[PDB]
């Protein structure tokens, strides 16, 4: 979490 990673 905490708003980083996974976009793609």
């Amino acid at each position, epitope marked *: 979490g905490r708003g980083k990673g*996974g*976009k*793609g």
Partner: antibody
Amino acid sequence: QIQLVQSGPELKKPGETVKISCKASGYTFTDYSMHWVKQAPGKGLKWMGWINTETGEPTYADDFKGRFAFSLETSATTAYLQINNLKNEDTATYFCGRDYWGQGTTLTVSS
Amino acid sequence: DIQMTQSPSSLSASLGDKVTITCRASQDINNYIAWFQHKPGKGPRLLIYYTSTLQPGIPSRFSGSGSGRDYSFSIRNLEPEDIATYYCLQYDNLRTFGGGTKLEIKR
């Protein structure tokens, strides 16, 4: 495919204003916060803050409180960085992004 | 604010070598570290987030490990397209980049 496209390089005089654009596509714009990052010539990356793309609320890092403004045009899925009262120390390349990033916008502050 | 100390600032290694970069935080960041690749003229590329999760499309040669304050990032076998400056980023509380590591590839 995800792409972030920033506006082109800029020359500005001290005291002037610059506004840099960051056009996002390929994903849901309001699902992810947009961060801004500064890279002065020959230095590393420095985080400037982020803007919540759902509320438009910006959060600035300590060194970027005052002359810096994050904004949005959500209908155009575009983020903006405005720098007022430009200083020589603002000469840098600025990046928008989070997981994926724009190509950078080089700003030169000079007379 | 959380400070990040990245080491080494410059790294020389041969093609095919394993290379390792470390970052230490000024306090426990509970695995909220990311690693970026940056080539001049391009935007940063996120390689790894949450210490060890690879982004989609990132080669399996890249990995990360660590916990608490101590983290590492490794390239299993250095390859020419890896030429870049690498940065860690804590995102436990706000954001802080490490100072960066420049690569010198030997061949």
